[PDB]
């Protein structure tokens, strides 16, 4: 009850925050503006450097994720299999790194 | 100079007249960040630019 | 006459040469720094 | 009594966003040979206050927005986000005590970006989009390393639990067996906030440029809050004070006085040095962190088996 | 009465946040760019003023012409102006930017700002130095602290 | 006669490249810049207390214009026409006509002040000393008419600042 109490005081002091710096001056008397960057009538292009590198993140935050409950697993009693299991997770997202390494995949946004 | 006490015709060359114009050459294959570099490492003014 | 000129035995030296101070120690003794901190941690 | 606590909590916050804006003015200038604002209050004291009544009644853009929903929820999430990160700090005591403390803020951290990417996409420019991209990128790419090395000190540590983290610290520092973990996790809190020599916005578009006054406000409170917050962190992690329990008062005054010193060497990194490329951070990131990363996590992985140094689960 | 006290305090505090916060965007167009940026030095310190160095021109207040405005560029000038927030105030420092100067009777040169921008504060130089340049901001603050907006509304 | 910037060739020996590889995996220079930043920050800094301290200023320092008088209350300029024929911006229009005692005087002297490039050609160019450039700065306005400077406000500022003008072209006259 307590982090729900927290939660909701956070939200409601940053809303308030938001109304505030979104109307008080809304209030006062301005003259107005016209509808009217350097790509306005331009196209965006896509870029697949941008897109590759999102999902590598992606993969390598899967294994990170996969990689997690090390402290909570140090404490077994099989110590011979949970070292020989986690060396095995961080060599495998090794090998996965190097082999985007080797592959041009980390290029202009290395 | 044509006799007069005033001068007929002063052209003004420019150091940074004839750099500006290579800066479409040195800047090829490069970043868009790496361009002010360029326009940086070329001591440009462009008071003696335009003239 | 009084003219705006230097003294008459000159003015002083100016150094006008690159002076970087080579300080500090070398890369053998920042790595063995390096590894005794580490190993008193682990300690 | 607990909203109580939540008002302490949050007032000054806001207070030391505000002075911390001060700070570094005066800071940033005796750096460069000169002086910080010292007109408008004696040495400058009442500047935020100045600040903040002209931010508050100057006349708001209305930008042309192509959805004005994003627009007005992103200052509401990174507000959220940076105060609702405070709560689990052990100052020795914190104000929500969970057994996962350390995962919270990690999930605080990740969830954060969705305030640029909306302040991005609500933006009609297509130039703020893509530095929106660029930035969204290089705080999920610190995410990463962030994650690996707060992994790797916390399996020397045993527990999630952030107020663990000063029992584990009583004898000495993790600053010695971990350095350089302890730098590349400066490193990499210094390039999630978009700190320099890591900010590529005020370099050759921003995200927020098409924000009124107020909602630009807001984006900067939230973003020094996330800076403090993320000193803060860094001190209860890596250099952890003297705790007593019949004086808490003790270990307050220390931590205070660490984590200022790392709020004035964040400000003192910004006058040193020139700016990052972006593909130049991905570089460093990609080709030079996540290695030694990976390395230093086996290491630490091994290290406790090796040494009979494993730290009990409670 | 009550309420003339309180909008007159309400007006003097106004004007106090607003003239101990100015955010200037200045225009880096000629000589006197130079000679503002010498005024940026530590010498005289702009940013002890509270005023800020090379602010952004979507929050900034106030508009400072240095330079030579062109036939080529004014559109631009006027594009800039008309994309800052109300309150705003122009300052035109140096010749060039409130008669013309040495180029009054070229053909490309506008001869002063104030044809295409209202100007509040004319900084006369060539260039004005860093003091007078200085000094015209302190006027304009002092300009800006004998506002009446308030009492205006209220009287009206 | 020349010197060759950045052509040495860095030993191969390991203590060398031991040093290197502890130079960018320690961050020996990154230090050194903190260190430099760090002992800037405790020196004094050069800020000034303005307005109430000045910079230094010479007595040849080109300010505002002024129209100098005589010792007896007769002022100095006699329509020679001189100033505004050598004016670069061409900022001074005279206009003369004899007055009542017979007197050469002016009946016009603007100096359009927005034209003018305070360049000092004036006041090197005069016979007699009657145009100045005082040490005066501080002048700025809020109108762009208050910067058409008539004869009378030259007259008026020649009379304000001839205690200051008059010591300052006697400690630089020798010079000229
Ligand atoms: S007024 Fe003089 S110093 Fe200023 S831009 Fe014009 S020519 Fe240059
Ligand atoms: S200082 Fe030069 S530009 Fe100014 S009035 Fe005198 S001669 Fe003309
Ligand atoms: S040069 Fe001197 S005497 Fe001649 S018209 Fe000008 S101010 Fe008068």
Redesign the interface.
């Given at each position: 009850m307590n982090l729900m109490i927290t939660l909701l005081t956070n939200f409601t002091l940053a809303t308030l925050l938001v109304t505030i710096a979104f109307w008080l001056p809304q209030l006062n008397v301005y003259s107005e503006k016209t509808s009217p960057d350097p790509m306005g009538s331009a196209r965006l292009p896509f870029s697949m450097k941008f897109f590759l590198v999102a999902i590598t993140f992606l993969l390598f935050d899967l294994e990170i994720a996969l990689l997690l409950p090390l402290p909570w697993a140090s404490q077994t009693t099989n110590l011979n299999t949970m070292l020989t299991m986690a060396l095995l997770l961080i060599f495998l997202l090794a090998v996965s790194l190097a082999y985007e390494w080797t592959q041009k995949g980390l290029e202009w946004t290395e | 100079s044509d006799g007069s006490s005033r001068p007929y015709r002063c052209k003004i060359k420019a150091p940074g007249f004839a750099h500006l114009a290579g800066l479409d050459k040195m800047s090829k294959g490069h970043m868009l960040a790496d361009v002010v570099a360029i326009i940086g490492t070329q001591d440009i003014v462009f008071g003696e630019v335009d003239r | 006459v009084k003219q705006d000129m230097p003294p008459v035995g000159g003015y002083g030296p100016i150094d006008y040469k690159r002076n970087l101070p080579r300080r500090?120690l070398?890369?053998?003794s920042?790595?063995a720094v390096?590894i005794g901190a580490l190993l008193f941690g682990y300690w | 009594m607990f909203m109580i606590n939540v008002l302490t909590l949050i007032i000054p916050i806001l207070l030391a966003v505000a002075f911390l804006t001060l700070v570094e003015r005066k800071?940033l200038?005796?750096?460069?040979?000169?002086?910080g604002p010292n007109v408008v209050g004696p040495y400058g004291l009442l500047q935020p206050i100045a600040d903040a009544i002209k931010l508050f009644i100057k006349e708001p853009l209305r930008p042309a927005t192509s959805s004005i929903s994003m627009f007005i929820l992103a200052p509401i999430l990174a507000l959220t986000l940076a105060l609702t990160m405070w709560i689990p700090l052990p100052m020795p005591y914190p104000l929500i005590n969970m057994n996962l403390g350390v995962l919270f803020m990690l999930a605080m951290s990740s969830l954060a970006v969705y305030s640029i990417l909306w302040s991005g996409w609500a933006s009609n420019s297509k130039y703020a989009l893509i530095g929106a991209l660029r930035a969204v990128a290089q705080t999920i790419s610190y995410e990463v390393t962030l994650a690996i090395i707060l992994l790797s000190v916390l399996l020397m540590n045993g527990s999630f639990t952030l107020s663990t983290l000063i029992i584990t610290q009583e004898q000495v520092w993790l600053i010695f067996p971990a350095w350089p973990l302890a730098?590349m996790w400066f490193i990499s809190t210094l390039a999630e906030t978009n700190r320099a020599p890591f900010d590529l916005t005020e370099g050759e578009s921003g995200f927020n440029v098409e924000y009124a006054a107020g909602p630009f406000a807001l984006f900067f409170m939230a973003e020094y809050a996330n800076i403090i917050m993320m000193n803060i962190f860094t001190t209860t992690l890596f250099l952890g004070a003297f705790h007593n329990p019949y004086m808490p008062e003790l270990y307050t005054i220390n931590f205070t006085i660490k984590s200022l010193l790392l709020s004035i060497t964040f400000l003192?990194?910004r006058?040193?040095?020139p700016r990052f490329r972006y593909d130049q951070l991905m570089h460093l990131l990609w080709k030079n962190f996540l290695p030694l990363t990976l390395a230093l996590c086996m290491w630490h992985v091994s290290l406790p088996i090796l040494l009979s140094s494993i730290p009990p689960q409670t | 009465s009550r309420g003339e006290y309180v909008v007159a305090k309400l007006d003097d505090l106004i004007n106090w946040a607003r003239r101990s916060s100015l955010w200037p965007m200045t225009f880096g167009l000629a000589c006197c760019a130079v000679e503002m940026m010498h005024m940026a030095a530590?010498?005289?310190?702009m940013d002890?003023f509270g005023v800020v160095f090379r602010a952004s021109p979507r929050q900034s207040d106030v508009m400072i012409v240095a330079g030579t405005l062109t036939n080529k560029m004014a559109p631009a000038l006027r594009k800039v102006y008309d994309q800052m927030p109300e309150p705003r105030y122009v300052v035109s420092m140096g010749?060039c930017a409130?008669?013309?100067?040495?180029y009054?009777?070229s053909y490309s040169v506008v001869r002063?700002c104030?044809r295409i921008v209202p100007?509040?504060?004319?900084?006369?130089?060539?260039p004005?130095?860093?003091?007078?340049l200085?000094?015209?901001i302190?006027?304009l603050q002092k300009?800006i602290k004998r506002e009446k907006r308030l009492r205006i509304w209220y009287r009206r | 006669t020349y010197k060759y910037v950045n052509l040495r060739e860095p030993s191969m020996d390991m203590?060398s490249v031991?040093?290197?590889?502890?130079?960018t995996l320690?961050?020996?220079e990154?230090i050194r810049?903190?260190g430099?930043?760090?002992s800037?920050?405790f020196?004094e800094?050069?800020?000034?207390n303005?307005?109430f301290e000045?910079?230094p200023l010479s007595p040849r320092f080109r300010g505002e214009h002024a129209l100098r008088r005589y010792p007896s209350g007769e002022e100095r300029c006699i329509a020679c026409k001189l100033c505004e024929a050598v004016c670069?911006?061409?900022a001074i229009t005279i206009e003369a006509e004899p007055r009542a005692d017979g007197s050469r005087r002016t009946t016009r002297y603007d100096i359009?002040?927005?034209?003018?490039?305070?360049?000092g050609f004036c006041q090197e160019a005069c016979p007699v000393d009657a145009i100045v450039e005082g040490p005066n700065?501080?002048?700025?306005?809020?109108?762009?008419e208050?910067?058409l400077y008539n004869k009378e406000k030259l007259l008026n500022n020649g009379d304000k600042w001839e205690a200051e003008i008059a010591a300052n072209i006697q400690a630089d006259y020798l010079y000229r």
């Open positions: - | - | 500090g070398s890369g053998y920042m790595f390096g | 800071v200038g005796y750096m460069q040979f000169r002086k730098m003192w990194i006058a040193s040095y | 530590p010498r005289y310190d002890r010749s409130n008669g013309g100067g040495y009054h009777y002063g104030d100007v509040d504060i004319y900084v006369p130089g060539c004005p130095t860093a003091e007078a200085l000094y015209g302190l006027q300009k | 203590k031991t040093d290197r590889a502890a130079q320690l961050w020996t990154l810049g903190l430099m930043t760090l800037y920050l020196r800094p050069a800020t000034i303005y307005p000045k910079g670069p911006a061409q359009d002040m927005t034209k003018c490039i305070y360049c700065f501080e002048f700025s306005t809020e109108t762009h208050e910067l």
